[PDB]
Amino acid sequence: DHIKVIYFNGRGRAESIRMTLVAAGVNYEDERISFQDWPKIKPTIPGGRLPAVKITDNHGHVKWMVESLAIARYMAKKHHMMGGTEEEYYNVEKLIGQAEDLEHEYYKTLMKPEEEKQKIIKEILNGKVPVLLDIICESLKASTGKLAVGDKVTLADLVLIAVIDHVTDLDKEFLTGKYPEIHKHRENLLASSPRLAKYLSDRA
Amino acid sequence: HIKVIYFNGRGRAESIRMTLVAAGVNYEDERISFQDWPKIKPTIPGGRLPAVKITDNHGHVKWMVESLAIARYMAKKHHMMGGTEEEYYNVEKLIGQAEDLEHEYYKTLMKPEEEKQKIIKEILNGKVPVLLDIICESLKASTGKLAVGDKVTLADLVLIAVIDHVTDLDKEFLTGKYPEIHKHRENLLASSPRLAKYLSDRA
Ligand SMILES: N[C@@H](CCC(=O)N[C@@H](CS)C(=O)NCC(=O)O)C(=O)O
Numbered sequence: 001d002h003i004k005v006i007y008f009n010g011r012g013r014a015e016s017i018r019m020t021l022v023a024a025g026v027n028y029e030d031e032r033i034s035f036q037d038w039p040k041i042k043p044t045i046p047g048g049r050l051p052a053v054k055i056t057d058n059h060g061h062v063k064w065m066v067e068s069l070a071i072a073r074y075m076a077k078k079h080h081m082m083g084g085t086e087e088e089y090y091n092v093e094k095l096i097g098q099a100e101d102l103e104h105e106y107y108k109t110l111m112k113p114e115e116e117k118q119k120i121i122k123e124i125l126n127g128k129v130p131v132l133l134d135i136i137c138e139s140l141k142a143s144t145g146k147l148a149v150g151d152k153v154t155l156a157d158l159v160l161i162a163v164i165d166h167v168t169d170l171d172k173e174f175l176t177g178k179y180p181e182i183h184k185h186r187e188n189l190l191a192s193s194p195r196l197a198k199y200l201s202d203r204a
Numbered sequence: 205h206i207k208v209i210y211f212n213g214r215g216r217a218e219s220i221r222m223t224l225v226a227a228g229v230n231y232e233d234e235r236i237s238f239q240d241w242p243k244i245k246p247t248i249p250g251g252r253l254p255a256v257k258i259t260d261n262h263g264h265v266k267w268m269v270e271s272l273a274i275a276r277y278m279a280k281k282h283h284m285m286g287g288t289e290e291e292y293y294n295v296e297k298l299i300g301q302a303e304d305l306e307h308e309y310y311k312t313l314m315k316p317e318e319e320k321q322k323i324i325k326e327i328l329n330g331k332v333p334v335l336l337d338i339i340c341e342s343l344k345a346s347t348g349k350l351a352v353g354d355k356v357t358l359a360d361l362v363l364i365a366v367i368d369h370v371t372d373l374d375k376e377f378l379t380g381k382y383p384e385i386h387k388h389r390e391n392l393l394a395s396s397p398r399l400a401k402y403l404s405d406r407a
């Protein structure tokens with residue numbers, strides 16, 4: 001099976017799919033679509049929206065998968081990253097749901113002129129952003145291990161690092177000297193997964 | 205003992221109420237008024253509703269928060285998150301399509317009856333028919349008569365909740381259009397007499 005990840009932004013919705021495969025040691029091909037070629041590639045993608053993943057087997061037959069975090073939960077489930085008990089599965093989904101609520105505040109600043117972006121940025125940062133960072137911080141304090149859920153990598157860890165990178169894109173000092181548990185989660189995750197540290201280091 | 209703690213009657217907790225109804229699992233509804241939220245807020249872990257408080261035989265309490273993480277945990281416990289990895293992907297796919305449509309609906313909420321009208325006319329000419337077409341195509345790919353296969357999943361219950369929100373915005377919006385969505389609802393209510401009874405009684 002040849003796996004191609006089709007997307008437009010480098011650290012958008014497809015990052016959860018790339019990090020789940022990286023952590024699993026699963027190889028894939030990146031295919032980035034420019035704004036310029038989207039009008040003619042759109043009708044070719046089932047449902048007309050990115051990211052999408054095209055899986056071509058040895059005989060050339062193609063399977064398509066859409067909806068970014070439904071693709072990431074399927075890949076994570078196949079590689080034992082959706083928890084190891086039903087209880088662990090609830091805690092993985094709990095943090096995923098918390099991170100996605102923070103990502104939704106970040107999306108409100110996107111593809112806007114650089115004056116309205118500034119206005120929306122100062123509202124969320126004094127708004128729902130610190131509220132949701134505190135809820136995620138408390139969730140991390142409840143884990144029975146050093147990562148988000150227990151002590152082994154799950155999809156919850158990778159969605160969290162992706163969303164925290166979006167917050168620091170809005171204001172790079174936002175977390176300086178605050179939310180130690182978030183900071184610590186990142187150090188712990190990169191130590192549990194050499195592949196992800198290599199991926200991230202290298203992406204930087 | 206399971207208590208579902210919430211404020212709106214057909215808001216985020218509906219996914220949790222319908223998973224329990226479909227599973228034949230009894231629970232208690234505890235609706236919080238706008239007037240009592242200031243003092244009950246500090247008592248709920250995370251400070252946000254809906255929440256589910258589970259009190260066992262000896263009085264010990266477990267809390268669960270984040271609506272669709274509670275609903276996928278109950279659905280998983282009752283065979284409603286698909287029967288193969290492939291069905292689970294398709295369950296999650298439709299869930300993610302429905303939540304994108306619910307996000308358009310949330311943009312109209314708790315607004316003065318003026319700008320609510322303004323936001324309604326933009327989404328209904330916007331992302332709302334785009335996402336209803338994508339859901340309609342997803343239902344046509346199912347290997348059975350419901351959203352995923354032929355037995356109830358969480359994907360079916362999130363879809364009826366979100367479709368009820370669209371008709372709240374414009375009651376004629378699906379009249380004479382999207383036959384697969386209409387058909388899905390008829391099929392689901394015949395597959396789960398408990399849910400037909402719940403909705404009927406709710407109505
Ligand atoms: N909830 C879906 C959202 C897919 C989506 O909204 N994609 C947008 C950008 S990430 C898109 O393709 N826009 C272009 C178009 O559809 O013409 C997911 O997470 O995959």
Ligand SMILES: N[C@@H](CCC(=O)N[C@@H](CS)C(=O)NCC(=O)O)C(=O)O
Nearest residue numbers: 097101216251252253254270271272
């Ligand atoms: N993503 C969370 C959202 C929880 C949330 O946003 N709750 C809102 C209303 S549904 C709330 O409790 N607002 C009141 C407050 O926290 O003071 C879920 O689906 O459970």
